[PDB]
Amino acid sequence: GGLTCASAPQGTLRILEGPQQSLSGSPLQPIPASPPPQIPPGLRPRFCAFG
Amino acid sequence: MIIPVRCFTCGKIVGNKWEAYLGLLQAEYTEGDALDALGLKRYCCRRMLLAHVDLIEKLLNYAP
Ligand SMILES: [Zn+2]
């Protein structure tokens, strides 16, 4: 009436919960790159010679 | 701290164009047009007002 060893298991199942990968879009930056410093339009000379 | 009285390079007197400069900037004028309308021709004078930091207004805020 006691507990005895039974037949060895024939296989093992290991369960884990996993989600999946999306598409590669690689959206690097809101406003991207190093935007260049640049000329103010027209500007004009702010200096003249004497005479 | 407070506006220099005379430009350091050529002793042109710029200590009376501080309030006029502030008034022309409140009216919508660029710093270039503003410095022109004040008579600051050579850039040695223009840097004297363009790059002035008025720290007398921040010291004049702690108790007497
Ligand atoms: Zn000067």
Curated annotation (Swiss-Prot), chain A:
Family: Belongs to the eukaryotic RPA34 RNA polymerase subunit family.
Protein location: Nucleus, Nucleolus; Chromosome
Assembly, per entry: Component of the RNA polymerase I (Pol I) complex consisting of 13 subunits: a ten-subunit catalytic core composed of POLR1A/RPA1, POLR1B/RPA2, POLR1C/RPAC1, POLR1D/RPAC2, POLR1H/RPA12, POLR2E/RPABC1, POLR2F/RPABC2, POLR2H/RPABC3, POLR2K/RPABC4 and POLR2L/RPABC5; a mobile stalk subunit POLR1F/RPA43 protruding from the core and additional subunits homologous to general transcription factors POLR1E/RPA49 and POLR1G/RPA34. Forms a heterodimer with POLR1E/RPA49. Part of Pol I pre-initiation complex (PIC), in which Pol I core assembles with RRN3 and promoter-bound UTBF and SL1/TIF-IB complex.
Lineage: Eukaryota, Metazoa, Chordata, Craniata, Vertebrata
Protein name: DNA-directed RNA polymerase I subunit RPA34
Other remarks on this protein: It is in an antisense orientation to and overlaps the gene of the DNA repair enzyme ERCC1. This gene overlap is conserved in mouse, suggesting an important biological function.
Record-listed Phosphoserine modification sites: 26, 34
Region (Disordered): 18-41
Function: Component of RNA polymerase I (Pol I), a DNA-dependent RNA polymerase which synthesizes ribosomal RNA precursors using the four ribonucleoside triphosphates as substrates. Involved in UBTF-activated transcription, presumably at a step following PIC formation.
Species assigned in the record: Homo sapiens (Human)
Start-end of Pro residues biased regions: 29-41
Name of the gene encoding the protein in the UniProt record: POLR1G
Domain of life: Eukaryota
Residues of the full protein shown: 103 to 153 of 510
Curated annotation (Swiss-Prot), chain B:
Subcellular location: Nucleus; Nucleus, Nucleolus
Keyword match Electron transport: no
Any single GO BP term: transcription by RNA polymerase I
One GO molecular-function entry: DNA binding
GO CC annotation: cytosol; nucleoplasm; nucleus; RNA polymerase I complex; RNA polymerase II, core complex; RNA polymerase III complex
Pfam annotation, one family: RNA_pol_N
Keywords of this entry: DNA-directed RNA polymerase, Metal-binding, Nucleus, Transcription, Zinc
Location (main, coarse): nucleus
Binding residues for Zn(2+): 7, 10, 44-45
Keyword presence, Ribosomal protein: no
Entry-linked InterPro entries: RNA_pol_su_RPB10 (IPR023580), RNA_pol_suN_Zn-BS (IPR020789), RPABC5/Rpb10 (IPR000268)
Signal peptide: none
Family matches, as PANTHER family: DNA-DIRECTED RNA POLYMERASES I, II, AND III SUBUNIT RPABC5, DNA-DIRECTED RNA POLYMERASES I, II, AND III SUBUNIT RPABC5 FAMILY MEMBER
Family per record: Belongs to the archaeal Rpo10/eukaryotic RPB10 RNA polymerase subunit family.
Annotated function: DNA-dependent RNA polymerase catalyzes the transcription of DNA into RNA using the four ribonucleoside triphosphates as substrates. Common component of RNA polymerases I, II and III which synthesize ribosomal RNA precursors, mRNA precursors and many functional non-coding RNAs, and a small RNAs, such as 5S rRNA and tRNAs, respectively.
Oligomeric form and interacting partners: Component of the RNA polymerase I (Pol I), RNA polymerase II (Pol II) and RNA polymerase III (Pol III) complexes consisting of at least 13, 12 and 17 subunits, respectively. Pol I complex consists of a ten-subunit catalytic core composed of POLR1A/RPA1, POLR1B/RPA2, POLR1C/RPAC1, POLR1D/RPAC2, POLR1H/RPA12, POLR2E/RPABC1, POLR2F/RPABC2, POLR2H/RPABC3, POLR2K/RPABC4 and POLR2L/RPABC5; a mobile stalk subunit POLR1F/RPA43 protruding from the core and additional subunits homologous to general transcription factors POLR1E/RPA49 and POLR1G/RPA34.
Record-linked NCBIfam families: PRK04016.1
Protein name listed in UniProt: DNA-directed RNA polymerases I, II, and III subunit RPABC5
Protein's organism: Homo sapiens (Human)
Gene: POLR2L
